[PDB]
Amino acid sequence: RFLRTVEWLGNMLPHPVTLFIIFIVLLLIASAVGAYFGLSVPDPRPVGAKGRADDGLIHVVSLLDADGLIKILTHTVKNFTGFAPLGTVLVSLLGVGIAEKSGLISALMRLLLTKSPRKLTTFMVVFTGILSNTASELGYVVLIPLSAVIFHSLGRHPLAGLAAAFAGVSGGYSANLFLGTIDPLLAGITQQAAQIIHPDYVVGPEANWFFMAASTFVIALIGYFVTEKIVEPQLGPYQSDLSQEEKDIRHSNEITPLEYKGLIWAGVVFIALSALLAWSIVPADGILRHPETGLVAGSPFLKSIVVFIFLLFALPGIVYGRITRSLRGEREVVNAMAESMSTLGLYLVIIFFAAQFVAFFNWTNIGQYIAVKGAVFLKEVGLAGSVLFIGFILICAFINLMIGSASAQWAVTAPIFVPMLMLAGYAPEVIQAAYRIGDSVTNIITPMMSYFGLIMATVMKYKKDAGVGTLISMMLPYSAFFLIAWIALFCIWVFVLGLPVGPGAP
Amino acid sequence: GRFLRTVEWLGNMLPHPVTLFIIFIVLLLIASAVGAYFGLSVPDPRPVGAKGRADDGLIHVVSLLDADGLIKILTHTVKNFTGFAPLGTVLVSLLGVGIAEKSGLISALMRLLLTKSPRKLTTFMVVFTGILSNTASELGYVVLIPLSAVIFHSLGRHPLAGLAAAFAGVSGGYSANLFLGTIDPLLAGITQQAAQIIHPDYVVGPEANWFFMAASTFVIALIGYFVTEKIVEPQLGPYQSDLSQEEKDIRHSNEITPLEYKGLIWAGVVFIALSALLAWSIVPADGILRHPETGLVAGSPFLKSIVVFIFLLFALPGIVYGRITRSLRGEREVVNAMAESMSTLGLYLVIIFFAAQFVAFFNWTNIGQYIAVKGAVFLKEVGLAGSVLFIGFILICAFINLMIGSASAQWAVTAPIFVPMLMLAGYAPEVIQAAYRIGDSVTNIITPMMSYFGLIMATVMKYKKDAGVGTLISMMLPYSAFFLIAWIALFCIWVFVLGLPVGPGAP
Asked: In the list A184, B5, B258, B387, which could disulfide-bond A205, CB 3.0-4.6 Å?
């Protein structure tokens, strides 16, 4: 009855939008009650020569109809529009759509399992599973039942190959090399949630490139224990009677000389773009730096690295698409962008209510109150660089089983966590990295994602199991060997190295 | 026909509005880089006042200096796209339209009109109902078209004039309706973002056209007796029994049940209890919502938050109609359904990402103000008065509407070219937006390569099997001729008699 508890976890509390509704509903009466009779919090820590004032007392502010109603009504489209994630995600996704549906990303992951050696593919299947998070679908449909099929011909066993790439896709979610559509997405919410105390901070789209790139190999190497974790539970059936028609038909999805001729001719335009972006930033006589200073930090470059990942995705895809005739018309690629832009349906609502939640939070000053009261807590017991950040990863990997689903979680918790752990002596870029560990690790063990469906359609293609929900108990050690494998990699980024760490000058 | 070839050629000549925006900014890059490379200038902009931009005169074209031009584009892409007024205002409003629609609150309203209306009215009613079915942007097609055609075999006379009645009501009665909509803050947004080029600080609310379009819902309803003159044209002899079969009485199952009776009475109660709230705030001079430190009414946050009010007055009655009739139960159900609506704007964002990225290039390269003044010296030359000039406008946008014209797909294209020069002519963007909103809804009945042939032509064969195809448009020609002339008049009363914000002065 550990399954039942995990199922109760996700099916307990209402929608994350409904959360934001009750949040900004209760916060209204929170401000109303708390600031009706009398309340105050004595001290912050804004030490400096003016600017950030010396004054200690920052009070909760009610819903006094006069200024309150005017503020909510005037700032609604204003909150939404200026909401940090909003424009940044869309601009980036605009380019992602083309790369994905041009069959560029499709054939890119379709050719590696063909090119990689046997001993390598055993670990490459998982390693590739990690990098398929930028496409948000490829990893499930044409990689999961393909990983399982590649293990009958080029591998050992399918029911541990379905799992080989499912640990990579679901588990190695946030970990990826090039900035995904999550990097400027999560950097956005982390940004607009960190402006409750230091209202000028900007979480770049580059955020955790160093961490997440170095974290691809580390978890891919615990994908080498899949050779130790295939035999340990059990083994069984041998080819033949295991859905053979759909097995060896999964081979035409391998590659064609057209797909290769594109990859070789889309890589050309990719490396071209990549070289161009470097031109302007390299020299000290360079054109795109900070115009006054000359220091790369703070330059328009990092302010346009959302446009750059819109570029580095779109244009390689379009050249791949035209040259191999993947998609012809110039009215076709636009009718295709509209398709990808049609998928962010729920995203906007939770963004309208996150803007609204971080608004109702911010200008009622309750958000800063919660921030400092949690700051005095975590600097008490002696919670140093890795006590606070082990205690962090564990909570956002536990709440992830209830309401946690990428941004649905973060949009809720970031207004609660990030203003409070910033003051503790630990910068917010670091806690966005740590959260981008916690949401990805426990994805395997059931939240309430019903994407079991396609996965179950793969398990029945091989081992028709007696009990259903066997894959989750089977998958428990894979999310255990990943939890510890990642947390360890993070502490080498706090008591060892971290470029923007602490609210000081690291 | 001789004219169907040229109409077909109209819409399929040029590419998608986005590809239209791509080349518009691509040429604007070198339009700036050619005209401002060697030298160019334009004299005497007409300003107002003693200080500010009241003097200094000349304004020039600005090229692409690779240091600054590149920086402005790379830094400002999301900043231009977010601040883009229509994008912010539309999304907030669409949430309200979604709940009001899916709950079957608007569905059961146009479903209630054709039922509760007398047969003499039904010819004037099905067209008038046809007009108000634009706020839903779907309802008027799927059901109301073959519903009008199933009423003409029961409460009417011949069911190919009902197929035509409500169709003239929807596609023709597009932009003028009751209780605002989504095009009210949409069009007002892009028109606003076209006035940012000259007056800069101009704000076009969604309610700006509300006085106009509301009254203009009747003109198109009284010509709902001109359908009575259109059924007379080649009426035939099918007397029931013809082409529609058992799909006729199944089309009665959507009539009414006491559930939607008690539901609309209890959602209507909510609706009328909502507007009752929004009036208390603005009525008294001792009231709470005005311009805070100045006894006022306009300029107050009210008109600034009426983009929200249309989201409120739509969503809230829809919920009650969905919880009282149990059209949608769960509290996680109405939220899982708000996400379906924002999907539909898939293309809308792109064209509005490139419109933000078109009025961007256009405005800070100063070419938009150049085109503005070289056309402002044009239209005040002939003697083009308020009435005379604005007939030339209605027709051009009711002509280009057959090529790239589709709601805001052309408006995002022609607003940055028309509104700048025609404001300086002495005519404020408010009545210009009123004029464009006239012209795109006229030639919609004749084909702008309309993507909606299906629902309509599946109703003709199901009522009058036609040997030829495309006989509906030739049939529709006189129905767009008796609306073009009609509406051109109704606006010219407004321009030569009354309009609250007309002219870049103080009207």
From this structure: A184
Q: How far apart are CA A422 and CA A379, in angstroms?
A: 11
Residue A360 backbone dihedrals phi, psi, to 5 degrees:
-55, -30
Q: Of A107, A35, A27, which Cα lies nearest the Cα of A64? A: A35
d(CA A401, CA A434): 17
- Closest-CA residue to A401 (of A113, A2, A11): A11
Phi, psi of B231 (to 5 degrees): -75, -30
Residue A480 lies in domain: 1-506
**What distance in Å separates the CA atoms of residue B230 and residue B160, rounded to the nearest whole number?**
10
CA angle B74-B80-B84, nearest 5°?
165
Q: How is residue A48 written in tokens?
A: 């400096």
CB within 8 Å: A90 and B349:
yes
Q: What is the resolution of this structure in A?
A: 4.0
CB contact under 8 A, B292 and A65: no
Task: Please state, in angstroms and rounded to a whole number, the distance separating the CA atoms of residues A150 and A486.
Answer: 28
Q: What residues of B are in contact with residue A331 (Cβ under 8 Å)?
A: 15-16, 19
Q: Tell me A75's DSSP state.
A: S
Inter-chain touch B70–A339, beta carbons under 8 Å: no
Show the CA angle centred on residue A414, arms to residues A411 and A415, nearest 5°: 95
- Of residues B66, B301, B343, nearest to A74 (C-beta): B301
Count of C-beta atoms within a 10 Å radius of residue A294: 12
- According to DSSP, the residues that pair with A41 across neighbouring strands are A58
DSSP letters along B116-171, please?
HS-TTTHHHHHHHHHHHTTTTSSHHHHTHHHHHHHHTTTTSS-TTSHHHHHHHHHT
d(CA A48, CA B195): 44
Distance CA B473, CA B167 (A): 11
- Residue A215, classed as helix, strand or coil, is helix
Residue B445 CA to its chain's centroid (Å) = 15
- φ, ψ of residue A41 to 5 degrees: the values are -120, 115
Say if CB A362 and CB A138 are below 8 A apart.
Answer: no
Residue B287: burial class (beta carbons within 10 Å; 0-12, 13-18, 19+): exposed
Number of domains in chain B: 1
* DSSP reduced 3-state for B42: strand
Of the candidates B414, B410, B385, B401, the residue with the CA atom closest to the CA atom of residue B502: B385
Which residue in chain A has the smallest CA separation from B350?
Answer: A338
